[PDB]
Amino acid sequence: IVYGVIGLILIYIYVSVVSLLFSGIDRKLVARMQRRIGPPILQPFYDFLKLMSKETIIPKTANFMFKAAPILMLATVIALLAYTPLGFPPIFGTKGDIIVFIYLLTLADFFLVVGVMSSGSPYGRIGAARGIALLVSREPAMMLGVFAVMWAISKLGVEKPFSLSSLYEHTIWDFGPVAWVAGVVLIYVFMAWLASEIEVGFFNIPEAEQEIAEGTLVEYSGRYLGIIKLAESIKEFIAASLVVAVLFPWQLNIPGVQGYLINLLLHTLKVFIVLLVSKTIFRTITGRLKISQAVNLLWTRVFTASVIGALLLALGV
Amino acid sequence: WVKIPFGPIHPGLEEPEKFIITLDGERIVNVDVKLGYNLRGVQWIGMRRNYVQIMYLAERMCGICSFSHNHTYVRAVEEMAGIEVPERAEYIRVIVGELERIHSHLLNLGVVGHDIGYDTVLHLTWLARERVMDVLEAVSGNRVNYSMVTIGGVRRDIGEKQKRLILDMIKYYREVLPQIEDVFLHDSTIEARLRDVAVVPKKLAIEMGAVGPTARGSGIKEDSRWSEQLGVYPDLGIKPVTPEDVTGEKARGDVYDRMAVRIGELWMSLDLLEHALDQMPEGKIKTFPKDNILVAKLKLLGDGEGIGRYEAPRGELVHYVRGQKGRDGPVRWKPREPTFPNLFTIAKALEGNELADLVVAIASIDPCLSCTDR
Amino acid sequence: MFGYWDPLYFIIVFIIGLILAYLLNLWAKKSGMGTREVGEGTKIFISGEDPEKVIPGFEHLEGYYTGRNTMWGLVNGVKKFFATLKNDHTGLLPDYVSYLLMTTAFILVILLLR
Amino acid sequence: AEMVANKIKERFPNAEVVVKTNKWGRERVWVRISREEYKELMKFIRELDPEAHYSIGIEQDWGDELGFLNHILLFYDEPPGVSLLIDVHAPKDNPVLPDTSDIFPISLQFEREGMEMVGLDFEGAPDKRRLFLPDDFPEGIYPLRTDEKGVPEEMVKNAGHPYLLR
Amino acid sequence: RIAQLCKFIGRSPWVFHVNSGSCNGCDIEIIAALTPRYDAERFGVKLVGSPRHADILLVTGPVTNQSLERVKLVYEQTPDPKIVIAIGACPTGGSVFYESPFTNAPLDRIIPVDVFVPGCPPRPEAILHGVVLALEKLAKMIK
Amino acid sequence: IRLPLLPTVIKNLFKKPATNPFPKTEPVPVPEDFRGKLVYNVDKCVGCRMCVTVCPAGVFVYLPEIRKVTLWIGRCVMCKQCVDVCPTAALQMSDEFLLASYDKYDAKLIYLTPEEAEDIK
């Protein structure tokens, strides 16, 4: 049990170093794509410190949740790190532990919306009802794909079914010729979910657009803003780690007490290659859409393809 | 119903105003407009200055269209008192105005691309504007608010070095205009964000007197460079523009036709500047030179009415000047800006569409408020 | 479902997460300035608490947690479902009595046959 | 063209029709009306030709003979074109004048500016609310009025020189 | 009172400009000082959308009577250490609007300005020079 | 489904940044007859009061008993109408444009200080 605390502290310090550095490389590439020098590489490690520097402002009409939601957001991200596949099988992975993952990946955004909406002026009230419509609209699209693949990798035999430690035993890519089509339909629905969860591209709706550019987080000002800008970057790393876990886990065997860190580096490199397409290219190449058009796209051209992929992969076994 | 304002101090906007809206959750049931945040009292200062000082108070009235207010005022004073203008002065005027409307259209093309996301189109069109900026800096003075038209004629001529310097940016833009022609026609974002919003019928386009590209987009062909024969404009070729030539044959003026019109006017200006550059004589530019005897003549010119009209980059503006003899300056001076009826026209074309349609509809017609609430 | 002692580890990792996240504010309150309490909301700065030049704010919002329409072919059936069910509950005593009478007869008729 | 002067002349006597040409080949017709003939002529311009747009709504002050003038423009189907100018006058003893916001529905928007700048209360227009003049501001303190109620003399602030303070 | 961990805001300032009655000549220079030819993001500046975030206000325009409380209202909501940079020849006493009943000129009599930049309008290199000069003042003020 | 900027962006990444580093290099060079800070002389000044008639933005205040005039250049707008109306030519336009400052009433932004005014008298 005490050997499960050392991992939860050390992997947290590792991920909190790496994620901001990936964000800095991303801003440099986006700046070079349109004829610019761009900021230096470790630029977020200055913005974080100056946001912790300043004077926090509390409005006169504010609850006890204004000062306590940017604690619970970071808390349910740090507590989510212990269940994620970092390349080796996770620490607390038992027979359940998929619904705990889906529940805690849903619950952080609800803490964010409750923290924004629990203030005064009604810019936050309009910038929150736009948030939860997009939250409800993007999570029947991943449940079907992940439940279909977790059910289908349990036919050929495993001892911890419906668990993320079971996803290193056997993958999709050895079910025969018909699975090669479900592979690309599932690459489609997972890239669409990964772009719509970290909210960049078409789906840059509730962040820097409250009627022009006000945003959802128009109100948090001091320490609280620094904590929220850290927590969203850790969640950026977590969701892409899930996407590279389901799609193609191809790690080395390499027994010993140092094959763990080699597999950890190889997983970090695959995370970088998956972000590089989605976030960078899809941010540079396409603007916003709308909210009434961002809802009828995730129920028509994403959720439909999940049903096609799940049904076609069910007709392979 | 919820009552939220629009805010004088925003992100996105460059001028303060108040567009009050009653919103039914996500739709708009009514919108009204109040203004008066740029109210610097322009007529009241202009009532006690002499004739020369209003020529410089007039161009600082707005920043983007800073040549038009300097132009029509001189047209009005010359129409009132009676002063001839030579050929070279008029040629330089139609070079400078037609060269600055490209500067006025490109930043509008960049700002509309900023409110729908798309930082890329912003940085690339504002990189393309710099050749016109360096030309205007080389010929006149500073970048914006440049003054080179007096009561007599122009203040400096272009010479022969500026001929070489201007005949290269034409060749530079002939390789740039097809790219923004080709991006604009078929995008996944432009035709899904600025199409079928704020439709304007011809009946309300005529009865509320919409003027500029908001008018001829829905279809009413009129142009003050054409509808009155002004200067050397008739004998070098001038036509109105229509979105039928740029984008197939559509006529439904919503937002997309207005951008089609603002690209067609660039295609007209690149030839109307080209042909008018070699058709000039040599002569004089400054009817009575050495502007000392001009300040010894302000007591003598006067006793009449006067009105002047011209094509602004956003519409058709008009000034009125009445002065009386034995005086220093005028008696009454009134300017009219082209975005006054366009701002009162769109407030009914915003008849229950969306919420995020508001910025892309308002910023579609250049809400340059600095000439609106004067 | 999961484990036998496994719902007790969830509390352990959750509490150690709150301890780290609260320790970070306990550090960052010391270095850096304090706080204060202003009120206008930084929300359309023209007015905070005023009366009238034109119409203004204080038109507060109720519970409207819907700003979207899927295929725009389901809201009509949902409203046609809620209308009949909403005006079934009349509030007259023969409704109560007739309901329990037909329930008793229904269970009796099924129990006689099979 | 140049024939509309004769057509307004032969129909409406006791008016001042004149034609002005100035120095680059442009002609403009000027006419000065009484009151009831002004309303009848604004009826007549809309029936003389289908809908013609008009530019400006200038008011001014000549003493106790306040005026109003307009720049209606029509026959713009050909590159010659024509543009007429109307004006009417009013006494300060009875500052009323009939509105035309039944024919040209934008004249209310210049009429509001006309009320708030220089006197001149029109007919029962549907809206008499003000625009671009602040509400925290006195009542009969008409700013573009020449000598009667120039705002005060004493609320003209200067932000003066540094030499005059040393 | 300025304590110590504020050397970092000299390497990452965030701006937010407050128009009060300008004629849109300097607002172009605020916007065009961030395009690829006169680039400024390599210092770290970043046009932010609310006065809670920012720490350099960037006031333009002559202070028009209607916009006189707004300028005094948005000055409290920016947090601590912040500076004020006045851009143009109309926060510095009007330019042609020094004799109106509507424009109360220089912006110093409303809020405590730090660095003025003359010109009409200034070229965008002068704005970079002004922000470098004000930021080295506040680096001096720390120590 | 239609992404036309993509070949442009991929070509654009493999080129030069095309920018201008200002605190390492000279700035963008000015043209010849560029407007700048107005420079003034005292020795050639007949005091004919012609500048105060034509200036749209009052920087000039005439003062008698010595036939000179002072100025405060922080309110100038660079419109040249004092240069081309002065007969004696003691007003020129310079090429400076880096004019940031700390205070309004500096020593660079005012000419003919009152101590020098009594030194003339």
Ligand code: NFU
């Ligand atoms: N175009 C244009 Fe302006 Ni800023 C307006 N309205 C002035 O003519």
Ligand code: SF4
């Ligand atoms: S400072 Fe000068 S250029 Fe800028 S808005 Fe004012 S008058 Fe215009």
Ligand code: SF4
């Ligand atoms: S500059 Fe010219 S007008 Fe002014 S005081 Fe000297 S000589 Fe007279």
Ligand code: SF4
């Ligand atoms: S440019 Fe000339 S007219 Fe304008 S303030 Fe300067 S000296 Fe005076």
